[PDB]
Ligand binder design. Sequence first.
Ligand SMILES: CN(C)C(=O)c1ccc(F)cc1Br
Lengths: 179, 245
Amino acid sequence: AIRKKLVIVGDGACGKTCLLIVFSKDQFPEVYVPTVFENYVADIEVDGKQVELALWDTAGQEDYDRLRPLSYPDTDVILMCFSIDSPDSLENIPEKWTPEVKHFCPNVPIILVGNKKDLRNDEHTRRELAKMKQEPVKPEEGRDMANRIGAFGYMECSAKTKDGVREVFEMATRAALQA
Amino acid sequence: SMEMDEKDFAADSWSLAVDSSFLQQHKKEVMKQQDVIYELIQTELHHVRTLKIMTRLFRTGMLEELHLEPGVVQGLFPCVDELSDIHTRFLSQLLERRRQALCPGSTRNFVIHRLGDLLISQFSGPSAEQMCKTYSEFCSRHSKALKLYKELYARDKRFQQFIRKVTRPAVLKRHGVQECILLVTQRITKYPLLISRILQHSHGIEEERQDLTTALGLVKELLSNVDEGIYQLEKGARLQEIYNR
Ligand SMILES: CN(C)C(=O)c1ccc(F)cc1Br
């Protein structure tokens, strides 16, 4: 099994911590959802290849520009996250997160991930966003941003229901294995 | 970690650690506050364990088994004794607050009502100055430690055999040398997230809400000072590269 490193980046409200927790336990916690994620090494077999995929979160480092880059050395794949219930999290992708990741992780594949996809058709979410002249992120808006930023691909998931979570990490493993 | 503390923090939450008959005596808001305090102590116990792997398994094993050049082990594990002293002392205070709160006849049923004062003490005065000095030094030497590790693993056979030997057990799966270094660098930025969530469930006693608000501010001040005090050291960097920063 070859060792690969994955780092997830995105705004504080993007759901990156929850996504790593749900994947690493293969379960949305029924009693207590942890506030933080330390690290994890997942055993993944994708397209017949066995990989040990180390997972890291950047939560808590968003305001600290000299501490945050210490998470990037030798990263093999980046998950760049935004929440579908937050068009503001999607607007910060191209000129804040993307230039930083391209600088510290040159030539590393980026997968743009739309989290909380279950909220796209949530009535409470649609009412709250409409007060700021907003609506949940549409799939084409996500794909277009991924295309513009030079992402390897665009994917969506819901940590709450687990839908799409396995597929995101299997694809990240395939991206980490490419030349 | 020692078995007594591992068993006390084996459960995924405070609500699963205490007896169900004790859990049922508390209101939902108390259970939510205690679950987050339990996560702060449990993650602190694991952080002190990461530092013990670095000092006892790696650092001391390299000194006792290998023939490394002088200054190489200090380069791989900068400030680890100072970091161990800071966090073992903090963990001791957290565990003593829990132990004093136990019900007589129980080794698992407790409620911690007064964490804020302990956090203000940790993140103020000389202990905060030592945390700031130690993390500014450690985090500035982080890139250099990773590069030194990679060079030794690729070129020294006895070093590669030593690493493969001591990291083979399944309990070391997440704790290779580079993984330990990044776990330590990331620890300090977990504190505001944990403290803010404890504060969210600590409004019942106004003195406690005020104390956690003060602690959160002190932790953010420490992080801002550490972040401003970092500049990565590079082996063989020339003075001209430094003054042209
Ligand atoms: C001076 N120095 C080591 C860097 O700027 C750096 C480079 C790459 C990386 F992934 C993280 C960092 Br921090």
